[PDB]
Amino acid sequence: RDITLLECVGKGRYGEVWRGSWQGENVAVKIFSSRDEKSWFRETELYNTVMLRHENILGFIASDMTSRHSSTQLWLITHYHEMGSLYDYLQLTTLDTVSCLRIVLSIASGLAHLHIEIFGKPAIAHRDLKSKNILVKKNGQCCIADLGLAVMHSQSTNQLDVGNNPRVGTKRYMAPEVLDETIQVDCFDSYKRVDIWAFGLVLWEVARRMVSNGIVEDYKPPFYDVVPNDPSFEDMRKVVCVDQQRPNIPNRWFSDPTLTSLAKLMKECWYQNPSARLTALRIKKTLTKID
Amino acid sequence: QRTVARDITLLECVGKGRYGEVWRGSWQGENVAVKIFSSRDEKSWFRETELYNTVMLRHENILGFIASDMTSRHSSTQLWLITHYHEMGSLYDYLQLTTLDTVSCLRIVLSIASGLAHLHIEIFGGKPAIAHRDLKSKNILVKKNGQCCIADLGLAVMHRVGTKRYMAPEVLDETIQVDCFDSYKRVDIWAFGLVLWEVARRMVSNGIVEDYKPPFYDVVPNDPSFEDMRKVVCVDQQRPNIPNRWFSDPTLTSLAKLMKECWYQNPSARLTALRIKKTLTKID
Numbered sequence: 001r002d003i004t005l006l007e008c009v010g011k012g013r014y015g016e017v018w019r020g021s022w023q024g025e026n027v028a029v030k031i032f033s034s035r036d037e038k039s040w041f042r043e044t045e046l047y048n049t050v051m052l053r054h055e056n057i058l059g060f061i062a063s064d065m066t067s068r069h070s071s072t073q074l075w076l077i078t079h080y081h082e083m084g085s086l087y088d089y090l091q092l093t094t095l096d097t098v099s100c101l102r103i104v105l106s107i108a109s110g111l112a113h114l115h116i117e118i119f120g121k122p123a124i125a126h127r128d129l130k131s132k133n134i135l136v137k138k139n140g141q142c143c144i145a146d147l148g149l150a151v152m153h154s155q156s157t158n159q160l161d162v163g164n165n166p167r168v169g170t171k172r173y174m175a176p177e178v179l180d181e182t183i184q185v186d187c188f189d190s191y192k193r194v195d196i197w198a199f200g201l202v203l204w205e206v207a208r209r210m211v212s213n214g215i216v217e218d219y220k221p222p223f224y225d226v227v228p229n230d231p232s233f234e235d236m237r238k239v240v241c242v243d244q245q246r247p248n249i250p251n252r253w254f255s256d257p258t259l260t261s262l263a264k265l266m267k268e269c270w271y272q273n274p275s276a277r278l279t280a281l282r283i284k285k286t287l288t289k290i291d
Numbered sequence: 292q293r294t295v296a297r298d299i300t301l302l303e304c305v306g307k308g309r310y311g312e313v314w315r316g317s318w319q320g321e322n323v324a325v326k327i328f329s330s331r332d333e334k335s336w337f338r339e340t341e342l343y344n345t346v347m348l349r350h351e352n353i354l355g356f357i358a359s360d361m362t363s364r365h366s367s368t369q370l371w372l373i374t375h376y377h378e379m380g381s382l383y384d385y386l387q388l389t390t391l392d393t394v395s396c397l398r399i400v401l402s403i404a405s406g407l408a409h410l411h412i413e414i415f416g417g418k419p420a421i422a423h424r425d426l427k428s429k430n431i432l433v434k435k436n437g438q439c440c441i442a443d444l445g446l447a448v449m450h451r452v453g454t455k456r457y458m459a460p461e462v463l464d465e466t467i468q469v470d471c472f473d474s475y476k477r478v479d480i481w482a483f484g485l486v487l488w489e490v491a492r493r494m495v496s497n498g499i500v501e502d503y504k505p506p507f508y509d510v511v512p513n514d515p516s517f518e519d520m521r522k523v524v525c526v527d528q529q530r531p532n533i534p535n536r537w538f539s540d541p542t543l544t545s546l547a548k549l550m551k552e553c554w555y556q557n558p559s560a561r562l563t564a565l566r567i568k569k570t571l572t573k574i575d
């Protein structure tokens with residue numbers, strides 16, 4: 001059960017993540033901020049589900065809440081992915097067709113796994129999908145991380161579990177209905193459609209790094225060109241809801257059949273009408289067909 | 292950077308039920324109690340963990356929290372709750388063999404009242420108000436200093452069903468106002484009154500003591516049904532017998548009055564935990 005904390009690989013308002021050693025193997029140890037205690041508990045409820053386990057979902061090892069006197073620590077222990085997040089990976093590396101499709105199909109596979117109920121594992125909507133919440137594995141596939149905001153639904157019992165977490169999604173990735181706060185809060189389909197919007201943005205971030213005809217774009221986050229650094233909720237609402245902005249499709253993509261197919265797919269994630277957006281299953285099937 | 296010693300040696304099993312098991316364990320020399328939950332009772336681990344993630348209760352008469360642990364296994368999730376270890380065991384265990392004097396009886400019941408009032412009271416700045424919902428002598432531990440602490444917040448409510456033998460009449464007749472937090476406090480007070488009866492029987496006066504018996508031992512079977520309890524408590528309106536010998540002893544006379552005021556059919560007539568404490572501080 002003993003763990004050695006070896007180096008900090010991330011620190012923010014969320015808390016910190018450490019590379020640690022456990023029985024000679026690297027593990028990731030997240031120490032939550034007290035400010036985010038409700039994410040720790042939610043992530044623990046989600047990882048209680050044995051049938052959540054999947055090659056494209058960050059592997060769970062343990063969760064602990066420890067306390068003496070008035071001090072509490074909140075720990076999550078997972079698999080460790082040395083290559084880091086997709087956000088990290090894309091900064092420095094360009095992609096060929098095979099690697100670009102492998103990445104985006106693996107994320108689609110993880111998301112369809114979350115969204116589809118197993119009769120068990122409830123249907124799950126993530127609510128904070130972004131490139132920092134995706135890890136790159138040594139086999140070139142990715143896995144989805146951070147289930148602290150997740151919503152669960154059971155079709156068998158008609159039960160929607162939205163949890164108790166005042167945390168909201170990463171502002172840059174928020175869907176129009178999240179930014180204008182018109183999202184139907186008691187509708188499970190609404191949360192799936194928020195994930196699809198964010199998936200489209202991650203598809204765009206990845207596709208920019210795929211080389212075609214000797215051309216590639218630099219890594220940029222969604223809406224880099226239209227909002228201030230460290231954008232506020234209102235900054236995002238302006239560009240997405242008032243200005244109706246969507247990420248620009250570089251014209252060089254239209255010379256490449258793969259990037260042309262991906263541009264089509266990301267536009268079907270970005271409809272202002274949530275019910276028009278593709279399902280995660282349809283995205284997975286479309287990416288399985290694209291060459 | 293730092294070693295995080297998580298190894299707990301499980302040394303002996305001190306409890307096995309439908310809930311799972313409790314073990315005496317060791318962490319880094321320190322004695323701990325480890326409750327390993329059955330799959331049947333996972334929601335009790337989640338509720339106690341959610342409560343402690345909301346408010347880190349620290350009180351001499353509340354079983355001391357150390358850790359909640361979830362570990363992924365091949366094909367299951369393992370759920371452990373780690374607490375302080377009280378080697379003298381539960382009040383239920385303790386009363387079977389031990390008799391009490393006036394000072395030890397009062398110290399036991401005032402320590403319980405103290406833990407219960409701590410749960411019940413909202414503190415601003417603090418803690419939400421908490422009702423226990425399964426108070427009984429098996430959920431109270433005896434400490435070496437003669438005070439008790441309250442255990443098991445798996446059914447707690449902040450502002451599984453309770454043990455049937457200890458259910459208040461409004462729970463048995465399903466009239467409890469479930470939207471009203473004070474209703475849950477009044478259910479705990481009923482159960483406290485039954486625990487006070489269990490303890491008072493074991494207090495010696497004029498060379499006499501009663502044998503340990505659970506509440507309603509004379510009118511319901513072992514593992515009484517909901518119906519068995521409803522008929523006794525709601526339809527016939529029976530209450531535990533106060534033996535004549537108590538009325539020769541000023542302490543037991545005062546405790547009989549106190550437990551009567553926990554057992555009113557009308558929940559709003561019952562004493563509060565704070566008023567029980569004050570009454571107990573004025574006895575002897």
Ligand SMILES: COc1cc(-c2cncc(-c3ccc(C4CCN(C)CC4)cc3)c2C)cc(OC)c1OC
Pocket residue numbers: 066067068071318321357358
């Ligand atoms: C979970 O339980 C037990 C834990 C420990 C334990 C082990 N290492 C470190 C600590 C610790 C050090 C420092 C801080 C604080 C102090 C300053 N503050 C402003 C912020 C940080 C908190 C915690 C503890 C408490 C020991 C125990 O028993 C001896 C425990 O009980 C079984």
Ligand SMILES: COc1cc(-c2cncc(-c3ccc(C4CCN(C)CC4)cc3)c2C)cc(OC)c1OC
Pocket residue numbers: 009010017028029030058076077078079080081082083084085088132133134135145146147
């Ligand atoms: C998103 O969320 C969670 C992630 C992880 C996690 C797991 N493997 C590896 C990592 C990682 C390692 C290394 C880097 C490098 C990248 C580039 N380099 C310049 C700096 C550092 C980045 C990331 C992480 C962060 C664990 C979590 O919990 C334990 C997470 O929370 C659920």
Ligand SMILES: COc1cc(-c2cncc(-c3ccc(C4CCN(C)CC4)cc3)c2C)cc(OC)c1OC
Pocket residue numbers: 064065066073075294295296297318357358359360373
């Ligand atoms: C994850 O799991 C378990 C962990 C432990 C445990 C073991 N050593 C040290 C610790 C510790 C406490 C507190 C800090 C502080 C230091 C100061 N800083 C400002 C904040 C952090 C660091 C380390 C813990 C919590 C025990 C366990 O069992 C008794 C665990 O398993 C349930």
Ligand SMILES: COc1cc(-c2cncc(-c3ccc(C4CCN(C)CC4)cc3)c2C)cc(OC)c1OC
Pocket residue numbers: 305306313324325326372373374375376377378379380381384429430431432442443444
């Ligand atoms: C009620 O609930 C919980 C209780 C405890 C707990 C804590 N200290 C000591 C005990 C204990 C030790 C020893 C004996 C007996 C063994 C044989 N003989 C009769 C002598 C004595 C009984 C009891 C327990 C059971 C821990 C819990 O969680 C970790 C509990 O759940 C919240």
